[PDB]
């Protein structure tokens, strides 16, 4: 029985990239124009892209021109769709579909379809951080934990740029939730008030947090 199977779907944030692929069973793609079609939440189908035999012509819907690319691999029977600068209206189920009929002609319908892969683009392409304090006659440490922002980078200073000796701001870490975390610490005399200024340019967020015992 002839089959198509899409892979690579998932969640994306608006602005991000995602690549899909389509592999097949029980036929060879080389004599077929192959297509991508998507089903949007309203229920209707939208044609997305087409790639003719030998890759001679690559056509795309007006809504995805300059953002999507279709490719094919005839030797191992794959089709690809790269999606860049993705938008909330790209949210859909994506299908790979063969153009063909019992005897090929110069213009056939879509006679075989993959089961589809779900692609979800969420509207927030940025998220400001939450800022939590790391609370402290000798040598003492304190700092700020900068949690759950996207994308990079954040900037931290202390005392609006007045405190720079002993400041360590660590490289961000990618959490399993897709959001970044970092900490910034400073060592100060145990014997004054300390404020860390978190700047997140991507989300036009600026936070000030006072760290004290």
């Amino acid at each position: 029985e002839v089959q198509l199977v899409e892979s690579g779907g998932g969640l994306v944030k608006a602005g991000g990239s995602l690549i899909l692929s389509c592999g097949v069973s029980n036929f060879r793609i080389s004599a077929h124009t192959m297509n991508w079609v998507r089903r949007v939440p309203g229920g209707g189908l939208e044609w997305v892209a087409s790639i003719s035999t030998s890759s001679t012509y690559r056509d795309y819907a007006d809504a995805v021109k300059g953002r999507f690319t279709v490719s094919r691999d005839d030797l191992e029977d794959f089709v690809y769709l790269q999606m860049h600068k993705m938008r909330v209206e790209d949210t859909a189920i994506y299908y790979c579909a063969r153009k063909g009929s019992d005897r090929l002609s110069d213009n056939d319908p879509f006679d075989a379809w993959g089961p589809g892969t779900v692609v979800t683009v969420s509207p927030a392409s940025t998220k400001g951080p939450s800022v939590f304090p790391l609370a402290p006659g000798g040598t003492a440490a304190l700092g700020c934990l900068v949690k759950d922002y996207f994308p990079e980078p954040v900037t931290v200073s202390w005392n609006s740029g007045a405190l720079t000796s002993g400041v360590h701001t660590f490289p961000a870490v990618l959490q399993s939730s897709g959001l970044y975390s970092l900490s910034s610490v400073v060592t100060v005399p145990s014997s004054q008030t300390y404020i860390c200024n978190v700047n997140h340019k991507p989300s036009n967020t600026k936070v000030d947090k006072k760290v004290e015992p």
Binding site: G43, W47, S50, N107, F110, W113
Partner: protein, 210 residues
Amino acid sequence: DVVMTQSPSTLSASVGDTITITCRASQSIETWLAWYQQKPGKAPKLLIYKASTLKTGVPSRFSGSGSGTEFTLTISGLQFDDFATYHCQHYAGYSATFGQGTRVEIKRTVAAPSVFIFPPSDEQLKSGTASVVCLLNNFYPREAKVQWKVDNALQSGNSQESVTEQDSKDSTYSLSSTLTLSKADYEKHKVYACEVTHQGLSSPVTKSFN
């Protein structure tokens, strides 16, 4: 730039009916026109191409006609497995354009929803998040409007809906809508309301809690 226009958007019918779905093109497309069937969560299936050529294997109660700018899909004697969405498609050598789809559903009498609102549990609230649920139970037709109002301000972007398929027992629909907030955000306001509009309600129905 051919524009394809399918009507109607939704068709209610019974097993045994003869029904017709129309597709109109903004300019002549000769007979380059295909019809597809699609069930929820499944791949589309080709039924008819070249306006009237039935794909081998497709039952004979499906037929297509037309040429130029006006096309028709006819199902002569609906069966139970024919309730589905049908899509027309103008196809060209290197692109295609689809109509907006027609959802064919089982006709019954109008039934207004019963509406219920549920607050988040204390267990969930403790762990930092509040989910508020609104239930619309056993209504027909499916077209319903659910708006979330928090201290009288319409919510948007923070809720998701889920609708059942037509019920095996009574051919109605049910629907859940869930408004999701943080602990903090939840705590800032008092009155949480779900307001429902439906053909079988004389006026919109609101259910709320404090």
